[PDB]
Amino acid sequence: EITVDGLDANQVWWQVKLVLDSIDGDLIQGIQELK
Amino acid sequence: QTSKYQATSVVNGLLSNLLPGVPKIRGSKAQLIDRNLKKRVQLQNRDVHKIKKKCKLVKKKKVKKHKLDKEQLEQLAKHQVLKKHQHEGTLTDHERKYLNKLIKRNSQNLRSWDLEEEVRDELEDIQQSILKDTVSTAN
Amino acid sequence: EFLTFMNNTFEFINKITEETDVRRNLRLKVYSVLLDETSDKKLIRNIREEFGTLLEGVLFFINSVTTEIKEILFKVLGNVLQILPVDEFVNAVLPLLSTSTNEDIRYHLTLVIGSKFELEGSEAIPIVNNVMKVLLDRMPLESKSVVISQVILNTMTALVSKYGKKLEGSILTQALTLATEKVSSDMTEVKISSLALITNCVQVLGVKSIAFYPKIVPPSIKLFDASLADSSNPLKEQLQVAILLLFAGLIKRIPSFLMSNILDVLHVIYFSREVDSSIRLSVISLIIENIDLKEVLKVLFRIWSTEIATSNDTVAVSLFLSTLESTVENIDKKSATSQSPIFFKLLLSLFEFRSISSFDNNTISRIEASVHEISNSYVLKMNDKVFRPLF
Amino acid sequence: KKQVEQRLEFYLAIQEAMELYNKD
RNA sequence: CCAUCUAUAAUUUUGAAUAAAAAUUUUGCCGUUGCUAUGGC
């Protein structure tokens, strides 16, 4: 989960970076297969 | 006073895991400033990585000795349950196989002493010829 | 008379229990029953039950002891402890904890449980999980006793420290939850144990501990401020190093989350009077190598104008010099050019330090000399275009 | 002979915690 | 190295006093023998 409670956005932002970066790799391969 | 020792020890232990080199818990101001600045460079040069390696190895040796102690002790214990089971005919499938392996193990070993067949083929020829004369017995 | 017989009486229990042949050794006999499959499980339970009584009895005597008889009991106790596996020991001792009505005996039982695991490996992962659930469950019950509370907190610290990651997550997240609550405990002993766990818990959880970030850093900064005021505490030095060492732990595990509150972190390092300089200087080396330098450079200016410039503390000033100098040789050329206006703004403040400095000439002269060499480093590693306006 | 003589001469943690608890 | 600046030490003010504070300026080891001197390795 991405927590937005008692955190500044720079904390909130990066925790998006980790998930988004990791999901980018799996997202890219899925796009290639569906194409 | 137990709390003092316990409080020190938890702090003492945690220091090592994160800060190995730092010592443990137990005049002109210009002098003080320079000494701290000199302290900055020398600690930067400290070979902390070597310090971690020594602590790891010392602990690694201690655990390894105990694991061997457990291993040796269990192997001894594993033998008696076989002895009592064998004497009482309480052998399971497993025991009847390990002993069967021992039957194999010893039997293969004695073959090396028993010597090969081809020499027996010639040795027996030499053997019988010695015997007939010394016993004689033709008469 | 009576005591001499008791001295002789415990010589027996040592002699028989002493592990001096398969058949003589008590310890070996136990294992064969456990190893033997046809052994009745009820018989195994009796071994576990009889032992909880045996272990409790020896602890009772040791608790209620006479130096020569005290040591013999430990020989008896040591022989006792090695009789049965870690596996059956935990099963036979965990349910004695709740039953035991003496704070002393419970105090003793927690200590022995740890040392069973001080030399174990991954084979105890299922067992430790049982232990952690039990120890956590006992926490509300034993909050009244500080010593029992302190030690049990210490035990999880060793066990979270050792193969804590292999432990199932809910225990880790649960354990972090209990520690944060216990940080507010009035007893300094409960605190220092609470901080130590969170270090290990945060060390293992890492980013996953972010959910607890509001419940650790902001309180910890507040605790440090209270720490300065209450200088009479005998455990002030241990309390302070825990707070610093708490930041040090997470300065390696969550640098960028701590980036925003880095200013409070540096504030703790500067004014932590009790802690040794080496510890404070050491954790500084962690900050530079782990947290982005540009944000530090922005922060160094604010802390200097606010507190350090008026602090009149030699240690704080010296360490600030160490921090600020440390950044400049390590900061990149691109970062240096971008962050130049703040540094020069700080540099002017540093130059004006002589006006407000309450120290003697010798220190200020030395301080300026440090201020000048670093400035030479910073102006180098830049281009004309950025500097010409600044000049 | 004495000159020879001089030449001849020339050539547990829990237990600690348990004990510590008994003190207090 | 010299000078300068600090440090250490000494006289002085408030001060029962602590305290601050201006101010100024015989052995490596082991004994014996006094309150200083010499025996052994």
C88 touching chain B per CB within 8 A: no
Q: After what residues is chain B interrupted, C–N > 2.5 A? A: 26
Cβ contact D17–B1 (<8 Å): no
Cβ pairs B/C, distance under 8 A = 138
Cβ pairs A/C, distance under 8 A = 25
Type of residue found at C320: F
Residue C258 and residue C247 in contact, taking contact as beta carbons nearer than 8 Å: yes
Q: Work out the end-to-end distance of chain A between its first and last CA atoms, rounded to an integer number of angstroms.
A: 30
Residues 6+ positions from A8 with CB-CB distance below 8 Å = C260
Alpha carbon C234 to its chain centroid, in Å, reads 18
Residue C176 and residue C168 in contact, taking contact as beta carbons nearer than 8 Å: no
Burial C49-60 (b: 16+ CB within 10 A, else e): eebbebbbebbe
Cβ contact C210–A7 (<8 Å): yes
What Cα–Cα distance (Å) separates residue C277 from each residue in B39, C147, C153, C241, C280? 9, 31, 28, 11, 5
- Chains with 3+ CB–CB pairs under 8 A to D are B, C
d(CA B16, CA C156): 17
How many CB atoms are located within 10 Å of the residue B134 CB?
8
d(CA C45, CA C53): 13
Residue C318 and residue C278 in contact, taking contact as beta carbons nearer than 8 Å: no
φ, ψ of residue C39 in degrees (nearest 5): -55, 135
Footprint of strand E on the protein (CB under 7 A): B 27-28, 30; C 360-362
Alpha carbon C87 to its chain centroid, in Å, reads 28
What's the gap in Å between the CA of D13 and the closest CA on chain C?
A: 9
Residues 6+ positions from C374 with CB-CB distance below 8 Å = C324, C325, C328
- How big is the CA angle at B76 (ends B72 and B80), to the nearest 5 degrees? 165
Chain B CB contacts of D20 below 8 Å? 1-2, 5
Which residue from C112, C108, C105, C110 is spatially nearest to C86, judged by alpha carbons?
C112
CA atoms within 13 A on the CB side of B5: 12
Q: Separation of CA B126 and C1' E36 in angstroms?
A: 109
Cβ contact A6–C259 (<8 Å): no
Residue B130, both tokens: 């010695």
d(CA C318, CA B32): 8
Q: Do chains C and A touch (3 or more CB pairs under 8 A)?
A: yes
SS in 3 state form for chain A?
CCCCCCCCHHHHHHHHHHHHHHHHHHHHHHHHHHC
Q: Do chains B and A touch (3 or more CB pairs under 8 A)?
A: no
Task: Provide DSSP, C323-340.
Answer: HHHHHHHHS-HHHHHHHH
Burial C239-274 (b: 16+ CB within 10 A, else e): bbbbbbbbbbbbbbbbbbbbbebbbbbbbbbbbbeb
Chain E positions under 7 Å from a protein CB?
Answer: 5-8
Cβ contact C214–A15 (<8 Å): no
Which is it for the CA torsion C270, C273, C274, C278, positive or negative?
A: positive
Residue with tokens 């930041």: C247
d(CA C156, CA C163): 11
* Segment (H or E) for D7: helix D2-10
- Chains with 3+ CB–CB pairs under 8 A to A are C
What's the gap in Å between the CA of C363 and the closest CA on chain B?
A: 4
Task: Provide DSSP, C183-238.
Answer: TT-SSHHHHHHHHHHHHHHHHHHGGGGGGGGGGTHHHHHHHHHHHHH-TT-TTHHH
Residue C176 and residue C214 in contact, taking contact as beta carbons nearer than 8 Å: no
What's the gap in Å between the CA of C143 and the closest CA on chain D?
A: 19
* Segment (H or E) for B92: none
What's the gap in Å between the CA of B105 and the closest CA on chain C?
A: 24
Q: Which of residues 217-276 of C touch A (CB under 8 A)?
A: 256-257, 259-260
State which approach was used to obtain the coordinates: cryo-EM
Residue B136, both tokens: 């004689």
What's the gap in Å between the CA of A34 and the closest CA on chain C?
A: 33
Cβ contact C363–B29 (<8 Å): yes
Cβ contact B29–C314 (<8 Å): yes
DSSP assignment letter at C123: G
Instruction: Express the helix, strand and coil content of chain C in percent, nearest 5 each.
Output: 80, 0, 20
Q: Is C380 helix (H, G, I), strand (E, B) or coil?
A: coil
Cβ contact D22–C78 (<8 Å): no
Cβ contact C74–D15 (<8 Å): yes
Q: Separation of CA C256 and C1' E17 in angstroms?
A: 58
Q: Separation of CA C314 and C1' E21 in angstroms?
A: 23
Residue B36 and residue C319 in contact, taking contact as beta carbons nearer than 8 Å: yes
Resolution in A: 4.2
